[PDB]
């Protein structure tokens, strides 16, 4: 997941199973004030939903990851 934060400007989040890409795009905007280029989602073999959120070029995903605090 961290290779995507660096290379592809993509933030990887665990997301609620009931939420769609419209709600995920709004949520990252409201929580972290960041614009998503797209949201690619995925339901994992353990039953949880994973979201690949690529940010627009205006945002550097590595800076956002440090701000959240997991890198």
């Amino acid at each position: 997941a961290m290779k995507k934060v660096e290379d592809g400007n993509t933030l990887v989040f665990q997301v609620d199973i009931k939420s769609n890409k419209h709600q995920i795009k709004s949520a990252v905007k409201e929580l972290y004030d960041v614009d998503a280029l797209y949201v690619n989602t995925l339901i994992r073999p353990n039953g949880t939903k994973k979201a690949y959120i690529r940010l627009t070029s205006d945002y550097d995903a590595l800076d956002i990851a440090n701000r959240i605090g997991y890198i």
Partner: protein, 50 residues
């Protein structure tokens, strides 16, 4: 198969999570009687029936 329903895939997720060994700190509890997980399941041996 690769083409599966959501309801099928949700049952297969629970079956994976129930197929773990016993956490070892549980054997240290007072009046503990469980020595191992007695409900293990191997894919080739016992089928899920889903």
């Amino acid at each position: 198969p690769s083409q599966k329903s959501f309801r099928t895939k949700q049952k297969l997720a629970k079956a994976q999570k129930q197929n773990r060994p016993l956490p070892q700190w549980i054997r240290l509890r007072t009046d503990n009687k469980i020595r191992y997980n007695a409900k293990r399941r191997h894919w080739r041996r016992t089928k899920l029936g889903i």
